[PDB]
Design a protein around this ligand. Structure first.
Ligand SMILES: [Zn+2]
Ligand SMILES: [Zn+2]
Ligand SMILES: [Zn+2]
Length: 131
DNA sequence: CAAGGCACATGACAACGGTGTTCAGTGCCGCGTTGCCCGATACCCCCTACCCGTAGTTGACTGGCATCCGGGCGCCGGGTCGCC
């Protein structure tokens, strides 16, 4: 996980933590689990590295209803949409050219120069209903 | 003269006003700590220059050295050969 800044142990540690975690997480709870591992990193520094990862683009970023920004990394480079369960957090990556063509067609119809789509589908889990 | 009819105001009724606080999220500036990058420095190599130890050099050449006295002074102590 290369970063724009000079490599060191702490960015490697947070990158490895993101690698192990395959769920949507917030910065504060990410720091909580990171401290639980025992690295004892700083809050604001963790912010810098996660922000850098979001800027780099190798980690997707989502915004919750509460307004918190949450992050998680994706195995595949190409763009995709993550279906996520609020209770579980199971993020599954899917993509469809139909929505892309729809966006381009709308942009052309309205004479828009450039666009950027943000589509996230929320829903109820299959196993959450079961008990 | 008493009972029945209409005005204004009234006991509550929430919801705005405006402003103060709550978790929480994320930075914004202050203090301190970190990967680089090089640059010099200790430490292997090769070469030869020079110090230092060993071994020969065949006419003949076969025993030295200069001592030492003007203490001075007395005693100890032992050796040392005569003595009868
Ligand atoms: Zn993604
Ligand atoms: Zn998309
Ligand atoms: Zn679920």
């Amino acid at each position: 996980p290369p970063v724009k800044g000079r490599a060191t142990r702490q960015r490697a540690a947070v990158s490895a933590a993101l690698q192990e975690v395959e769920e949507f997480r917030s910065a504060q709870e990410l720091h909580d689990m990171l401290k639980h591992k025992g690295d004892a990193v700083g809050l604001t520094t963790v912010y810098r590295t996660l922000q850098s990862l979001a800027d780099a683009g190798e980690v997707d970023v989502l915004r919750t209803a509460e307004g918190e920004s949450v992050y998680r990394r994706c195995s595949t480079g190409d763009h995709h949409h993550h279906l996520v369960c609020r209770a579980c957090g199971k993020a599954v990556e899917v993509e469809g050219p139909a929505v892309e063509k729809w966006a381009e067609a709308i942009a052309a119809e309205h004479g828009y120069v450039n666009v950027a789509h943000t589509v996230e589908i929320f829903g109820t889990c299959a196993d959450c209903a079961g008990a």
